[PDB]
A paper describes a structure:
The [name]-1 Env is a trimer of gp120-gp41 heterodimers that are heavily shielded from the host immune systems by N-linked glycosylation and further protected from neutralization by conformational masking and considerable sequence variability. A glycosylated region near the base of the third variable loop (V3) of [name]-1 Env forms a supersite of vulnerability that is targeted by antibodies originating from diverse germline genes in multiple [name]-1 infected individuals. Here, we determine structures of antibodies in complex with [name]-1 Envelope for all observed members and ancestral states of the broadly neutralizing [name]-1 V3-glycan targeting [name] antibody clonal B cell lineage. Here we used cryo-EM to visualize the interactions of a complete inferred [name] clonal tree with the co-evolving virus Env.
We previously determined structures for the [name] [name] and the mature [name].6 Fabs bound to the [name] d949 Env trimer with V1 loop glycans at positions 133 and 138 removed. In the [name]-bound structure the V1 loop interacts with the antibody, the V3 GDIK motif and adjacent V3 residues, while in the [name].6-bound Env the V1 loop was displaced from this position such that it no longer interacts with the V3 GDIK motif. We found that the conformation of the unbound V1 loop resembled that of the [name]-bound V1 loop. Consistent with previous observations, the [name] displayed only binding to the d949 construct with I5 binding the d949 and the d836 constructs. The [name] clone demonstrates that these epitope sites are engaged early in the clonal development with the [name] [name] already in an orientation that embraces the N332-glycan, with the next step in the development being the acquisition of the VH G57R mutation to engage the V3 GDIK motif.
Author numbering:
A (entry chain A): 196 to 248
B (entry chain I): 32 to 140, 149 to 150, 153 to 185, 185a, 185b, 186 to 309, 312 to 323, 323c, ...
C (entry chain E): 136 to 140, 149 to 150, 153 to 185, 185a, 185b, 186 to 195
D (entry chain J), E (entry chain B): 512 to 547, 569 to 664
Amino acid sequence: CNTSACTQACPKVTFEPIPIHYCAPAGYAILKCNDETFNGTGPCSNVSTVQCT
Amino acid sequence: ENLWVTVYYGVPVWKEAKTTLFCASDARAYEKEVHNVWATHACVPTDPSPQELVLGNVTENFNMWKNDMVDQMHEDIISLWDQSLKPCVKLTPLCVTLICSDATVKTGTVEEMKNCSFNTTTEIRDKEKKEYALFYKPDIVPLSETNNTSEYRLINCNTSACTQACPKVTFEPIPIHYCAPAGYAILKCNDETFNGTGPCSNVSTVQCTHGIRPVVSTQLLLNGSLAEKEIVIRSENLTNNAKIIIVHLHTPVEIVCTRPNNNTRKSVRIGPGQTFYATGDIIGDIKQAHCNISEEKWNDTLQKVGIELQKHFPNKTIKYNQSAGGDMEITTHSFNCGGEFFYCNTSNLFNGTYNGTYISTNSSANSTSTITLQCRIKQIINMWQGVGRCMYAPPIAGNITCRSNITGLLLTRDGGTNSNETETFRPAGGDMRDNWRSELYKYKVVKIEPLGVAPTRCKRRV
Amino acid sequence: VKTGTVEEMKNCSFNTTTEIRDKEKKEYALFYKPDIVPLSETNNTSEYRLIN
Amino acid sequence: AVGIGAVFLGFLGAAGSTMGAASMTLTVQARNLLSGTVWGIKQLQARVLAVERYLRDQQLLGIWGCSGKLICCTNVPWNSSWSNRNLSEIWDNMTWLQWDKEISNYTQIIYGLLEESQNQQEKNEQDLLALD
Amino acid sequence: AVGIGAVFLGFLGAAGSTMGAASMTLTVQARNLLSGTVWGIKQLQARVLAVERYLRDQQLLGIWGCSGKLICCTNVPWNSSWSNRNLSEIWDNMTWLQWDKEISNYTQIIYGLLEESQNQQEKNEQDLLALD
Ligand SMILES: *[C@@H]1O[C@H](CO)[C@@H](O[C@@H]2O[C@H](CO)[C@@H](O)[C@H](O)[C@H]2NC(C)=O)[C@H](O)[C@H]1NC(C)=O
Ligand SMILES: *[C@@H]1O[C@H](CO)[C@@H](O[C@@H]2O[C@H](CO)[C@@H](O)[C@H](O)[C@H]2NC(C)=O)[C@H](O)[C@H]1NC(C)=O
């Protein structure tokens, strides 16, 4: 009552983390850096193409 | 000799038809992070390019009154206004019995406000404490037939509920460019002497329209477009006196209004995480809000409009009279400035006559002469009908200045009788359609039929 | 009713809030029996509630 | 004139001119049929835009036996009953708007005949090629 | 190599190879331009997808005078000022990415010239056929 109101979450819905595959739409492509020693910023000498993550 | 069919794709042909338009605005609105008008939220960044290309030799018919673009603009504005108030606090636990007394500020007394006290619920769901606030008289109504002068109620609960507008959103008019979608074209009548209905001998094609100010007014038109050459009169038909006459101006007329009261805001918290603002104490001497217009410029404009109107009514002189009256929202010049709604009286302005005798105002004996008007203020507003009309405008600290320009007027014929030699005109407002139709008369929308056929001396090779 | 009596309706009176947020006045209305249910186990025949 | 060089005649700069001069530079009229960006349901509703009418035009043109968004001469005879007018008065000093106004009453029959003429020619060519 | 037989090179399996080898198997790149199913307003907004860009490409290709989503040789002369490079160094040992990087600064003029070249050729052919 000092910041905002509240709401109760439904009981039948769970918060378990289900894996989600992020896929790209047609007309775009997803490139994946296959190098396992990648520092985070820089080029990769082995780049693959993936449909969905 | 013999001729055969041939099909052409891309032939320019125009067909007037209905469609939908998009809105665009300058990128300056997008600069604001949040709470900057509605153009940044609902419209696209624009571009002046391409220029208005002029066609070589064309002929077209333009109609101003028989158009649907104004209706679409009105619907879009209504939808935007309705949507904008959804998240803001809607109040409701505030129409309790108010105990109101005469306002007595430390510096004196004020007749336009009442000091109403009432119980309000605190952060606790069931717990009440007393609070006080100053309210304007028009928003106060006696409760019941029982003549108990100590009890009052807001002017509400008899028509519909109310909602408070958010404080971080402003009502400043940002120009909007109405552009057409692909497959349709916008034609513009370049003639500056166009009466409103008829053809134009110089028609151009435009990508998007110029800036349009979504302003609200009843009697006069605020800052906006200007005439190119001279004053032009537009009317649906002069046979019927009920129609509204729109008059343009060759030059603007300055106007400045102010409220020096220097009010201050309170902070009353009701419910979980939502507050209601109201005017509390007043610091400084009590004065009256006012409006200011120049006299010589107004008289010159009135004489110019009169001589321009003499062509349609050469056998009669010209006179002006006070408005019809009635409700405040009808007969009063209602407008907005900085979130504050002002209702001015034009009785002192529309009072004069002209019999064709032009009077020169080049003497300039006293350049400081001016005409002053007294105005009232309201918080509860019913902008339109059946849109959730009730709206609450929160107050603002300090005193404001609303310098602006006048470039148009709305007039109406009076009921003639006895073949009077001095038939008059009266101010008269109405729906915003009249206001928005004066700035969209040039533009028309057409659909393209690129396919065509024609004969020629050719045949298909086998 | 003035013309007689009806078995399929009951004359229920209750307090309702007026235009004022906190102010109540008595009102009456006729309601069909299936939409009327006894309130609680306490057998007080003068009290009833909607089937809701 | 049409001898500008690099064409920048805009969307409808050639309208109102003669048929011969306006015959060229037809590409700009057809090319400019795309614009807009998302705001709300109505914007996406309107964003179908020319994608439907362009496909309609492509279907009508391809069925008649024409490839490419340019001129295409057919073999249907021109029955003089429709116009019965001089060639010079149409192709030299008349614009497309008034011509379409005059000839707007005879659109269905010509399209219907062109629909089957192309199919007949295609079948005849197929038979000729299959005979060998 | 390109002699696989039944092509299953994926969407971009030929990228990074030589121009001659990568010249073939261009159909797979163009064909795979459709996917998705409805969820909410944003999904349908994105479902315009390649329908707009594909139509853009079709308009640009058809205006230039080419039918079919394959190679198409034009008649515009190749001004050496753009590249001034040996033929062998481009068509045998260079990939498309770096070539596009090099030649990305001269796209507007060539498209503009190709737009009017096809119209000129079409009008000349129409006049030649109409003369008889
Ligand atoms: C309007 O009336 C209210 C009371 O109904 C005034 O509030 C009281 O003012 C006195 C004197 O300043 C204080 O002692 C009380 O504590 C105030 N009451 C509350 C609940 O705060 C209010 O000052 C009046 N308005 C003005 C402008 O004076
Ligand atoms: C509050 O009212 C005062 C008096 O009406 C205003 O005073 C002047 O306003 C002009 C407006 O341009 C300023 O340029 C002056 O500096 C102000 N002071 C004086 C002494 O003239 C004042 O502007 C009003 N407040 C606001 C915010 O406009």
